[PDB]
Amino acid sequence: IVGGYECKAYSQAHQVSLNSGYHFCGGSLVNENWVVSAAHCYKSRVEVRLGEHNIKVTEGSEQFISSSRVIRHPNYSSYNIDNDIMLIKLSKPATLNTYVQPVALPTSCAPAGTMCTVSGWGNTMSSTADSNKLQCLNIPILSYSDCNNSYPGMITNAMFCAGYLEGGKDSCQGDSGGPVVCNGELQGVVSWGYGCAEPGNPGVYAKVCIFNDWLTSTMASY
Numbered sequence: 730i731v732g733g734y735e736c737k738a739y740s741q742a743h744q745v746s747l748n749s750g751y752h753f754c755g756g757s758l759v760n761e762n763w764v765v766s767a768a769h770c771y772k773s774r775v776e777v778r779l780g781e782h783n784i785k786v787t788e789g790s791e792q793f794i795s796s797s798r799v800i801r802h803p804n805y806s807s808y809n810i811d812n813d814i815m816l817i818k819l820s821k822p823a824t825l826n827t828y829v830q831p832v833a834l835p836t837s838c839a840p841a842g843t844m845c846t847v848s849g850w851g852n853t854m855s856s857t858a859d860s861n862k863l864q865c866l867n868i869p870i871l872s873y874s875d876c877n878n879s880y881p882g883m884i885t886n887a888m889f890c891a892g893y894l895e896g897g898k899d900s901c902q903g904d905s906g907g908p909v910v911c912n913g914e915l916q917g918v919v920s921w922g923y924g925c926a927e928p929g930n931p932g933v934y935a936k937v938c939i940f941n942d943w944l945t946s947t948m949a950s951y
């Protein structure tokens with residue numbers, strides 16, 4: 730997260746760290762057994778760390794659970810990073826408490842102008858911002874025209890832009906797979922962008938509201 734603020738410890742209870750010897754992506758707990766991330770974060774096996782604030786310090790709030798299965802969207806395509814969503818089945822259910830809570834899947838798509846929160850342990854491009862403690866950022870959803878203008882012809886129906894065309898504030902590498910929460914629901918998944926927090930290069934997110942049929946269909950296929 731570039732230009733954000735350190736989140737109030739555990740204010741983002743659904744936030745998870747994806748770890749394979751080190752933090753490499755984020756994810757969102759959507760229920761006791763499932764995590765939503767980015768298909769570009771795919772690994773056949775990962776350890777999901779819940780209840781985290783400072784990933785480098787044991788706090789007593791964490792839960793480490795290995796995955797029983799990692800399922801990328803059947804239509805994911807890397808050359809254009811389309812359908813950049815993945816489901817992770819936990820090997821054992823998370824324990825919900827003061828530190829671990831799921832985030833609800835969107836009923837409907839949020840329109841342009843909606844103010845949202847993005848969080849993560851990715852690069853902050855700041856000496857002063859410690860990526861080891863969860864960073865938060867409020868970003869507005871951009872219009873389709875501003876989005877397509879920024880990345881001509883590269884925006885599909887499974888993407889939306891959010892952030893600031895002037896730059897300075899954005900998600901960054903390491904934040905990928907993380908949540909974009911708007912009015913208490915998971916609207917996006919940190920996906921891609923050109924650089925981080927650069928003028929004219931807003932962040933691009935996977936558009937969760939068009940994947941609801943696939944998501945629920947899969948969560949019912951345990």
Ligand SMILES: [Ca+2]
Pocket residue numbers: 781782783784785786787788791
């Ligand atoms: Ca910790």
